[PDB]
Write an enzyme that holds these catalytic residues in place. Structure first.
Site, short mmCIF file in Angstrom:
data_model
loop_
_atom_site.label_atom_id
_atom_site.label_comp_id
_atom_site.label_asym_id
_atom_site.label_seq_id
_atom_site.Cartn_x
_atom_site.Cartn_y
_atom_site.Cartn_z
CG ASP B 68 49.30 36.75 33.59
OD1 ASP B 68 49.54 36.44 34.86
OD2 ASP B 68 48.15 37.44 33.24
CD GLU B 105 40.53 32.24 40.80
OE1 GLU B 105 40.29 33.43 41.01
OE2 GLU B 105 41.69 31.80 40.17
CB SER B 110 36.18 31.93 32.36
OG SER B 110 35.51 33.15 32.90
CD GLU B 143 35.65 31.27 27.05
OE1 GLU B 143 35.18 32.02 28.16
OE2 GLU B 143 36.57 31.75 26.63
#
Ligand code: MG
Ligand code: MG
Lengths: 184, 176
Positions: B68, B105, B110, B143
């Protein structure tokens, strides 16, 4: 019913609903920061007013049960790290939370996205809320952005719900705080 | 089959991150990747750090994730889109702020692997080149989980104009 609502929407309203569902957090953190009141960022206010109007064109065809998982942060700082002690719910503190919460009407400042049980209920987060949404309520079905189930049910911002019951579900390797509520 | 190398509780913690990753990553971002404002979470984070060190990419791979617009901060998150389009003037500023730069980060990172499809309905789509030799674990359709404090260089940022939407595309390379 996703189709019925879609037929009532303008092209820009459909785009906006999809914009929200794919980018929900910034809308909702804005709404929560200001306790559901607008006027703070006039540009996003413009979208929010249109999204409100889009949702008003929806009407639930029958009463439905939906659900939401949440982490403990929805309870505030005092409970957030104390409500669990390791993998179990703090019994004494839960008592305080329940007295504070049960029987009372709460407001969700953000838009309220909820999941629908098909063959599964995804209840891996520590808190699980089920909501009874009454026939005739403004609520629109939207495409889920998890490609899990196909649809979610989107409720207006400032939705009011009464917490009917609150309890701890004891599972084999976890404990879940269960909230049962009815949308007003 | 990296699961073999993990101790029992290491598997269990990878599981716990799966079930509720948001508390981990929110904590980590709020504390700029430094422990330890909250000791009980820190103990789990350290265990998970160890688990991820036990894996190693044998070859460079491409992964992706959608986001987002909150990743751009409060002053951009709700203004970068107007009228279903990316505001070009604000995008220039955003590109100036991020393109060519090495970012950290703070949360665990993920990512998904493209097989048949790339799910890019979120407004931001980041693709990352993850180098051979990088610590990165495969977890549960699987993942790729990269360690916290992963550094990546943003190589390119641009707007993808689709039929009915615009996507902010970020192309990045994970650093050693
Ligand atoms: Mg369990
Ligand atoms: Mg499109």
């Amino acid at each position: 019913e996703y189709k019925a609502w879609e037929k009532k929407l303008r092209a820009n309203e459909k785009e906006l609903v999809k914009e929200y569902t794919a980018n929900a957090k910034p809308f909702n953190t804005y709404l929560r920061a200001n306790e559901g009141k607008l006027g703070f960022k006039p540009e996003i206010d413009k979208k929010i007013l249109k999204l409100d109007e889009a949702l008003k064109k929806s009407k639930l065809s029958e009463t439905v049960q939906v659900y939401r998982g949440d982490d403990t942060s929805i309870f505030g700082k005092e409970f957030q790290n104390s409500i669990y002690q390791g993998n179990k719910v703090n019994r004494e503190l839960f008592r305080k939370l329940r007295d504070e919460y049960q029987g009372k009407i709460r407001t969700e400042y953000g838009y309220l996205s909820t999941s629908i049980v098909s063959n599964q209920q995804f209840a891996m987060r520590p808190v699980l809320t089920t909501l009874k949404v009454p026939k005739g309520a403004h609520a629109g079905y939207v495409d889920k952005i998890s490609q899990k189930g196909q649809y979610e049910l989107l409720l207006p911002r400032n939705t009011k719900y009464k917490i009917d019951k609150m309890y701890i579900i004891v599972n084999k390797g976890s404990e879940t705080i269960k909230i049962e509520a009815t949308v007003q």
